[PDB]
Amino acid sequence: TLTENKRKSMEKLSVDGVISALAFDQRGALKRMMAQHQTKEPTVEQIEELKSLVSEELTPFASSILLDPEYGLPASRVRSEEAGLLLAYEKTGYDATTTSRLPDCLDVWSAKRIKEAGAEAVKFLLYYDIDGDQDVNEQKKAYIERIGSECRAEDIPFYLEILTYDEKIADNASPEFAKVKAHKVNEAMKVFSKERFGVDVLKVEVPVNMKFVEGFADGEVLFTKEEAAQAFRDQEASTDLPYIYLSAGVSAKLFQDTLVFAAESGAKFNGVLCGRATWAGSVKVYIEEGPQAAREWLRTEGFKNIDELNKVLDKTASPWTEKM
Amino acid sequence: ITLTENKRKSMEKLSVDGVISALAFDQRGALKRMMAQHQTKEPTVEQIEELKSLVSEELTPFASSILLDPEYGLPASRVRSEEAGLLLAYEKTGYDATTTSRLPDCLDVWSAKRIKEAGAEAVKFLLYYDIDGDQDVNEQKKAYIERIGSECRAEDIPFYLEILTYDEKIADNASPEFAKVKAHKVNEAMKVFSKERFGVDVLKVEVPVNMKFVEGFADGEVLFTKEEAAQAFRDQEASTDLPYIYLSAGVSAKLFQDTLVFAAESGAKFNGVLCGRATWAGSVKVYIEEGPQAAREWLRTEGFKNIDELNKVLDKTASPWTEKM
Ligand SMILES: O=P(O)(O)OC[C@@H](O)[C@@H](O)[C@H](O)[C@H](O)COP(=O)(O)O
Ligand SMILES: [Ca+2]
Ligand SMILES: [Ca+2]
Ligand SMILES: [Cl-]
């Protein structure tokens, strides 16, 4: 059940019920990427410009774009007229001296202001360990309730992004984390699918680390294909809400092969909010060679990434208009 | 200007014939400290919760509603008169005295949804505001109130915004220095948060004057004539079209009551009060020292007399909030 306005906004973010969205709200993550190629700290102008370049060159090929309000408003104004807009509402990153990873809204923003800035959706990122401290998770659930209520009042779709972790596992790329990932992802989805959180779309990880799956793995194999497939069916069984996948910065090819595997396995996912798998290469070029070189990278390599993704989405994603 | 069906029903449960006679008892750290004064042991959760229940049970039959804190006040809320509405506070108490920003912060495991689920007919939130303060601080404060106002719209529960004014550069808001600017701080803060975007249903505000410096009411130095004081009330009435009620903290019951009369004479159309310590402060010493049954007897006699006298004054001074609809 969508209100008239939430439905209109979902339509502006989608094509034929599929979300082929471009993600560039990266801030903390962007900065870590930029640091690989220069000693100097990134300036505001540089961040704004790279976002604007990606927006201008690639949104003609996306149903919508996700940007951050801190650096991304100029970029939002040069997006394709056919592409919708999501704006991020959370502060970037988390405190690495504690395990709680508590969420925090941008200080001078509200769901109302995000709508006033021309967004068709509010996006919020929550770090969640289903097995973690219960009082921490109580605080997290309470915080999402507030945001869900705001979005109900402002009549703007609520896109909740969940990134999972384990309080006691330092590296979520490790085999140790791979072994519990499906549990973390699928049980978190089940919680945040509860009516009281007011989510319209879940933006989630695939429930497997594909690098440890038979046929995809280049080293140790932790899972057969059938086991991986069952993780995807468990994910589909964990919600009746629309959901879309994030890339997590894997290779464009691995992400594409994952979508194919997801669909074959029985996951009726409704699109992607994909960023780095598409544009990651532009960061090095932008820093070393500058804006025009980056533009040319975007028109060629960038386009090729997003075009190949779109072809894969076309044959793998399911429309959210059927979740209704 | 307008109320949904459920917000209107809730407002009616909070009032009597359009007048809010609300009993305030969301005190936390403040209440605990009073308690200490009368006894040796650190006050217990048991004690803090019990006094609230006694006050709630014995005095809410004579109030239109009661304001409680979710942290200690839920048991007290459940023994309130069935004819009394409930407001629950949503803010963390106090402020960082090392800084001047006094930023607002909601209780960590509460939401407007949870407040409604706990049986409340209103969400109360206390904001400290200096209209003349740091513009980025105030931008952050405005964003925060927008969020809560949106929550309350979605959960369809009245939003009561309490504003307490201060100056970043004046330590004592009881000083003559603050008195000279208080009308400015109060009235301009009301103008800000009366804007539609903040979603406020009722403002809970200070009287726009320190009556202790007004001619006729002052024991010492006199800063204002009666006419100057009255103009401040008329300016306050003109600062909002929303319902608003007065908070009493800072003055004696007798002076508060005299203030209500002066307010009405001056042309203020206030819609009630949120009155606390005046009404039950006396039981606190009796509860700690003579036990619970003694407090119940104090509340039934002195306690009733206090709230009854207040109600008699409200009857001749307050205006119904339905005349603002
Ligand atoms: O840490 P930051 O600086 O806030 O940004 C990265 C982080 O939010 C990620 O979760 C992305 O927002 C999301 O995954 C979409 O990007 P991709 O994963 O598709 O590349
Ligand atoms: Ca449901
Ligand atoms: Ca399902
Ligand atoms: Cl207190």
- Could you give the CA distance from residue B96 to residue B100 in angstroms, rounded to a whole number? 8
Contacts of residue A11, defined as CB under 8 A and 6 or more positions apart, other chains included, come to none
Amino acid at position B96, single letter: D
- CB-based burial of residue A218 (10 Å sphere; 0-12 exposed, 13-18 middle, 19+ buried)? exposed
- Could you give the CA distance from residue B159 to residue B150 in angstroms, rounded to a whole number? 9
Amino acid at position A312, single letter: V
- Could you give the CA distance from residue B275 to residue B249 in angstroms, rounded to a whole number? 8
Q: Is the CB of A26 under 6 A from ligand 1?
A: yes
Tell me the two tokens of residue B294.
């003694």
What DSSP string describes B177-226? HHHTTHHHHHHHHHHHHTSGGG--SEEEE--SS-GGGBTTT-SS---B-H
Residue closest by Cα to atom 6 of ligand 1? A26
By DSSP bridging, strand B122-129 and strand B65-68 are: unpaired
Element (H, E) at A47: helix A44-58
Tell me the two tokens of residue A230.
């069952």
Instruction: Assess contact for A162 and A201: CB atoms under 8 A.
Output: no
Tell me the two tokens of residue B108.
């960590």
Element (H, E) at A261: helix A252-265
Q: Per the CB < 8 Å rule, is B143 touching A110?
A: yes
- CB-based burial of residue A32 (10 Å sphere; 0-12 exposed, 13-18 middle, 19+ buried)? exposed
| Ligand 2 centroid distance, CA of A239 (Å) | 9
Length of chain A: 324
Amino acid at position B260, single letter: L
- Whether B301 and chain A come into contact, CB under 8 Å, resolves to no
- Separation in Å, CA B133 to CA B100, B168, B182, B204, B205: 9, 6, 14, 21, 18
Portion 118-177 of A in contact with B at CB < 8 A: 135, 138-139, 142-143, 145-146, 149-150, 152-154
Amino acid at position B106, single letter: C
Instruction: Assess contact for A246 and A272: CB atoms under 8 A.
Output: yes
Range of the domain at B17: 1-325
The crossing angle, in degrees rounded to 10, of helices B135-155 and A134-154 is 80
Question: For chain A, how many structural domains are there in total?
Answer: 1
Question: Among candidates B269, B253, B267, which has minimal Cα distance to B312?
Answer: B253
Return the half-sphere exposure (C-beta side, CA atoms, 13 A cut-off) of residue A50: 30
- Could you give the CA distance from residue A72 to residue A51 in angstroms, rounded to a whole number? 6
The crossing angle, in degrees rounded to 10, of helices A44-58 and A281-289 is 130
- Could you give the CA distance from residue A132 to residue A96 in angstroms, rounded to a whole number? 16
Q: Is the CB of A27 under 6 A from ligand 1?
A: yes
Contacts of residue A97, defined as CB under 8 A and 6 or more positions apart, other chains included, come to none
Nearest CA-CA distance, residue B149 and chain A, Å: 8
DSSP A62: S
Would you give the end-to-end CA distance of chain A in angstroms?
7
Instruction: Assess contact for B159 and B196: CB atoms under 8 A.
Output: no
- Could you give the CA distance from residue B195 to residue A125 in angstroms, rounded to a whole number? 30
Q: Is the CB of A275 under 6 A from ligand 1?
A: yes
Tell me the two tokens of residue A204.
């989630």
Question: Among candidates B179, B185, B148, B143, which has minimal Cα distance to B166?
Answer: B185
Nearest CA-CA distance, residue A87 and chain B, Å: 16
| Ligand 4 centroid distance, CA of B31 (Å) | 6
Tell me the two tokens of residue B135.
């513009």
Instruction: Assess contact for B154 and B3: CB atoms under 8 A.
Output: no
Amino acid at position B58, single letter: E
- Could you give the CA distance from residue B126 to residue B114 in angstroms, rounded to a whole number? 18
Element (H, E) at B229: helix B226-237
Return the half-sphere exposure (C-beta side, CA atoms, 13 A cut-off) of residue A104: 12
DSSP 3-state assignment of A22?
A: strand
**C-alpha A71, offset from chain centre:** 18
Question: Among candidates A216, A281, A274, which has minimal Cα distance to A245?
Answer: A274
- CB-based burial of residue B112 (10 Å sphere; 0-12 exposed, 13-18 middle, 19+ buried)? buried
- Could you give the CA distance from residue A302 to residue A305 in angstroms, rounded to a whole number? 5
CATH code of the domain in which B96 resides: 3.20.20.70
DSSP 3-state assignment of A317?
A: coil
Portion 195-214 of A in contact with B at CB < 8 A: 196, 198
Chain A residues touching B199 at Cβ < 8 A: 153
Tell me the two tokens of residue B129.
């505001």
Question: Among candidates A231, A214, A232, which has minimal Cα distance to A222?
Answer: A214
- CB-based burial of residue A52 (10 Å sphere; 0-12 exposed, 13-18 middle, 19+ buried)? buried
Give the method of determination.
X-ray
Tell me the two tokens of residue A127.
């770090």
Q: Find the angle CA(A54)-CA(A57)-CA(A60) to the nearest 5 degrees.
A: 115
Q: Find the angle CA(A77)-CA(A79)-CA(A83) to the nearest 5 degrees.
A: 125
Instruction: Assess contact for A297 and A46: CB atoms under 8 A.
Output: no
Q: Which of B143, B147, B199 sits opposite A146 (nearest CB)?
A: B147
The residue ranges of DSSP E strands in chain A, in sequence order, are 19-24, 64-67, 84-88, 121-128, 158-164, 201-204, 243-245, 271-274
Contacts of residue B266, defined as CB under 8 A and 6 or more positions apart, other chains included, come to B229, B230, B231, B233, B234
Q: Which of B109, B136, B197 sits opposite A138 (nearest CB)?
A: B109
Contacts of residue B271, defined as CB under 8 A and 6 or more positions apart, other chains included, come to B15, B18, B19, B20, B202, B243, B244, B245, B318, B319, B320, B321, B324
Q: Resolution in A, one decimal?
A: 1.8
Instruction: Assess contact for B112 and B152: CB atoms under 8 A.
Output: yes
- What is the number of other CB atoms lying within 10 angstroms of the CB of residue A230? 17
Instruction: Assess contact for B113 and A196: CB atoms under 8 A.
Output: yes
Element (H, E) at A281: helix A281-289
DSSP A21: E
Question: Among candidates A308, A310, A306, A302, which has minimal Cα distance to A286?
Answer: A302
- Could you give the CA distance from residue A214 to residue A225 in angstroms, rounded to a whole number? 6
- Could you give the CA distance from residue A152 to residue B112 in angstroms, rounded to a whole number? 13
- Could you give the CA distance from residue B61 to residue B68 in angstroms, rounded to a whole number? 16
- Separation in Å, CA B321 to CA A220, B19, B152, B202: 71, 7, 19, 9
List, in sequence order, every residue forming a beta bridge with A19; answer none if it has no partner.
A271
Tell me the two tokens of residue B48.
């803090």
- Could you give the CA distance from residue A209 to residue A87 in angstroms, rounded to a whole number? 28
Contacts of residue B9, defined as CB under 8 A and 6 or more positions apart, other chains included, come to none
Contacts of residue B193, defined as CB under 8 A and 6 or more positions apart, other chains included, come to B127, B145, B161, B163, B200, B203
- Could you give the CA distance from residue A111 to residue B286 in angstroms, rounded to a whole number? 48
- Whether A18 and chain B come into contact, CB under 8 Å, resolves to no
DSSP A36: T
Named by the residue before each, gaps in chain A exceeding 2.5 A from C to N are none
Ligand 1 atom, smallest distance to A249 CA: 20
Residues, CB within 5 angstroms of ligand 3 (ion): A 236, 240
DSSP A20: E
- What is the number of other CB atoms lying within 10 angstroms of the CB of residue B100? 16
Q: Find the angle CA(B121)-CA(B123)-CA(B129) to the nearest 5 degrees.
A: 150
DSSP A154: H
Instruction: Assess contact for A255 and A274: CB atoms under 8 A.
Output: yes
| Ligand 1 centroid distance, CA of B109 (Å) | 27
Residue whose token pair is 């709508």 = A115
Instruction: Assess contact for A112 and B197: CB atoms under 8 A.
Output: yes
Tell me the two tokens of residue A42.
């990134």
Contacts of residue B13, defined as CB under 8 A and 6 or more positions apart, other chains included, come to B65, B85, B121
List, in sequence order, every residue forming a beta bridge with B203; answer none if it has no partner.
B161, B244
- Could you give the CA distance from residue B252 to residue A204 in angstroms, rounded to a whole number? 58
List, in sequence order, every residue forming a beta bridge with B127; answer none if it has no partner.
B163
Contacts of residue B23, defined as CB under 8 A and 6 or more positions apart, other chains included, come to B55, B59, B60, B63, B65, B66, B67, B274, B275, B276, B279, B280, B307
Q: Which of B112, B143, B154 sits opposite A108 (nearest CB)?
A: B143
